[model samples]
Target: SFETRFEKMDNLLRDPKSEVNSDCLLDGLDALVYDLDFPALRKNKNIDNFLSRYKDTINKIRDLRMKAEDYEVVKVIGRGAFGEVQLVRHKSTRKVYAMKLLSKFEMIKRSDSAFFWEERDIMAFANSPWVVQLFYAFQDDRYLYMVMEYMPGGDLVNLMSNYDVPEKWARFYTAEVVLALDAIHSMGFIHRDVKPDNMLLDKSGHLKLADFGTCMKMNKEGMVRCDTAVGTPDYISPEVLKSQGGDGYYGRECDWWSVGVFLYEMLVGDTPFYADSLVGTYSKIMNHKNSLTFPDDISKEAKNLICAFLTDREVRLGRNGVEEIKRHLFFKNDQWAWETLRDTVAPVVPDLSSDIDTSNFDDLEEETFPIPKAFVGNQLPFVGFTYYSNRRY
Candidate 1:
């Protein structure tokens, strides 16, 4: 009975959206001793020994649920709008993980809940080489904790800051992005915020897509209604901007548009609609045809794919889905070797002194946050958002 019930508890613990709590786990210990006919099974010494030891461990849970206490924070690696990313090590296992500390006050204050639920679930479940992996997702009164892989190579934004990538290097990296997006899109969710910053590189230089705060599921037409702002304006699609300003529908093509902007930057140094102000940028994006331009030396094939992706959603390159992009001359088999990109030599590898080096990341200023737990509401908005991945990456 204890064995069977423990398996059930294991399932509950693994689910990122299950409503089970520490008390439910405590009940398992009670059921083991009071409900089980232990003496009757004591004739088997192995069974008796296991039940006694398991009971002791269950009783030893001084703190029942996963929390900040379980991890020892190393240093702040990244800072963002809603939270900061910390390099944390598990107290018991000593395994390193990247912990995204989402502010409870900000999350509740904004109430853009469509915001994080998908962010948590997708990281935990999008099992692919291109998607970042998750180890745990927990919460405290002050913050929501998402522990993911501690990528040492940093992200593309850092990589692209100074170096103008060669077209050969750009093609390889963009082809990798194509496969990454394919992996994510195959899962039926649209990555509304694909960009250079979100493209995190691994130790070996392969890219894994991150930051899913704006991701959402779509209808049969592969579209989602949007009434709020989504993604960074520099890479966001015109349809997405229209949808945000009013009530409109946008979908997978929006992701394609971001890719076009990304490739354009990789080739020509900056985004097509590069502007000095926010209003100016949005105006240029809304009028993309005149605003979007390239340097004199760009290639015809590169221009063709960027134009294909940056065009209207209804007739975009990926309008028929990934097939068109896969067949694009920019990523043809001779150049890209579709299935073997992962094993190929990465173009931008980070030189590291140790496994935990944060040199590739920006030097983050160490500012602390304080909050009163009294004002922090009942985190019902975040019920069932706990996960524990058993594997060590």
Candidate 2:
């Protein structure tokens, strides 16, 4: 058994290109984790089968719809902490779809910031081609169902997680996000949190911005406050961590700072100010004691543009508006419109094959709520949604 295990490790490490029939890629991972008699870093036993682990998800998708019978959900596509995505199909339309099941209770409990309301409001009021299209939404007592255009392809997070994506790909993805952010801002909203995990891909492999739990809407005059201590710790801007006598460092500039950090990570493959301890990271960001050091291979223009975003609030990009950032060297890949979904001219093209499969959920049963027969179709997707909007119909 020992000799056999060693042989398995050895064969797995060889590159796929070296073999005619072997799954070279995963074999490489197997070798990396188990070779050289390193017991300390053995692969987790419970993680034996990636696809098999999601058997429950497959069953859930199979039981989601009735009229859409005859469609089969092939596999579990994607899942997040608060939601699950499935690839499905509609029998009548003969169309494949990406279905997002939102656990409102879980979301509100996780952040306790009324994210459920925020997601509903932000998605409802906003619509852009570069943004994920909300095909339709429905609700049951336990969950809110969002039927979105299926991106047979998955998202940037998957690539960033599982593949060695090149710098050119990162730049192109960020450029499209820049335009989406620009359009969202122009509409009087601030995506307080901008990170790799939130950007997605469509069926055609086009980038679309998703997730809006922390987005802030401008007031009647279209101005918002700057002191919300939110967003992921590693990507948080410097001033956002600063305390200006109970007021936050500078509200909007914080978002620009995040953009800078994101660009820095994109160029360098790691975040600059991240530390295991929150206090250490906060101190580093607030004092600027250890600012991001640009990679040597990165262009000077790109470095300078990133600096412009990270500098003091007086000169930050967000303060100057989206146009300045658009003209910045980091985003100089190519000009893309806020409304245009296709920018095939850009350097990076996404592969969304990892997104949800729709056929499985086509025949599953959707849970329903008790309501008068006549008022059923008129009812909003969720009871909480109706309550938030203060509308009975």
Candidate 3:
């Protein structure tokens, strides 16, 4: 009996070229744990309890090998260098989701394999309402698929363009973004890309930060200093620009600079250092003489917060910590019920009539491509890849 169960466990552990059936693997592990009756193992009650609890959790996880036919593809919502994002609906429950499909061929050709793996792992662990949720992840012969929570309200960029966004609303949105960044930082990850385009609005109109493809993991000391110049040209920090020459090192302070740019964009119509070319933008960011200009209409508190965060890495607003930044004059006296921000009525509620409304999204010229054959007949080596989110919905 032990031999049979152990053999099953070994088979489950063996890597498969096709999609993985996580549910079956969990069952095998559960059976093995129950059958293993060694005297050494039974000596400790703590070990027994731990294994039992872990088995219970593994049993709850959904099967990773989800059928593609289960979802009905609606329309293309977004397109990027990675791939195109499509709105899909589950046939069983009629639930809507945004499906992101990444072609392995394109990833290998561009040497973006690492970034793709990082994006999925970050999404799996960085679970927060302020951040987008990844409900399910699976892979096929040619592509890797991630089914995520669909945001019907569209992105902040569209919201700002269509409506007469007031300063009060901007304050509300910025406050929420601060909390989101705090959560991300606390989890020992830096959202290197922070901009209005990456901030999507849920059906309730609250912001859910998306696009984790550029996120970087922090070190064991809760800080990382490296010279990988990666971010949008408009929001790149001074230190990041300097790092292009390969001499500078930056930490989470870089993300704070981006937040400052985002806040400025929210208040004003565009980024602070408005330049047409990438060279001009980099020069403007590195030049100390090109001072920041705050319009008279902007509040003193707002201007102070933006300037504080835009400073050098050593004196940045969040240099001390997230709590220190929260205590600033800009957020002073404001009752920041971070937990209940989702319930709070947003100033600009999305004009979505239904949960699956796609009216808010821009109509893109739909492009189609034939599914290619598998590039390699083996799973990509993705470290720290596991799922425990037992999502039934």
Q: lDDT winner among the candidates?
A: 1
Across 1-393, the per-residue lDDT of candidate 2 in tens digits comes to: 999998876755442223311322322332322222122322434433433454465346335422224345544566767777666765566666666676745644445565655565555556676677655454433465655566544566555655555656666766677777776776667677788777776656677777776777777755555555767777776655553456653355566777677777776777778768977777667765355565557777767867777777776776867777766665554445434536465444443334444421223322333332222222222333321112112
lDDT of each: 0.77, 0.57, 0.71
Which of 1 and 3 is the better model by TM-score? Answer: 1
Q: Give candidate 2 regions above 4 Å deviation.
A: 1-76, 107-111, 161-170, 220-222, 226-228, 242-245, 249-251, 330-341, 346-393
Clashes of 1: 1
Give all TM-scores, in the order shown: 0.82, 0.64, 0.78
lDDT of 3 by residue, 161-247 (tens): 886666678777887888888878877788888888888988778888888887777888665565557788889888777774457
Error of 1 at 111 (Å): 3.3
Q: Once superposed on the true structure, which residue ranges of model 1 sit more than 4 Å away at CA?
A: 1-64, 244-247, 333-335, 366-377, 389-393
Candidate RMSDs in order:
9.0, 20.9, 10.9
Off by over 4 Å in 3: 1-64, 244-248, 288-291, 333-339, 366-393
- What is the overall TM-score of model 1 with all chains considered together? 0.82
lDDT of 1: 0.77
Q: Distance (Å) between predicted and true CA of 363, model 2?
A: 22
Higher-scoring candidate on lDDT, 1 or 2: 1
- Candidate 1 clashing pairs? 17-384
Model 1, 1-393: lDDT tens per residue?
A: 999999998877654344565433443443343323235555567756776777756445525667699999878998887788998888998898899988766765556554887787678888888989887777654677898997898888887886878888888878888889888788888998989989998888899998888788888877788786688879989888888545677778888899899999988888888899988999999998787787667778989999998888887898887877988887654544787889888877777888678888788772333432222223445545656423224
Error of 2 at 121 (Å): 3.7
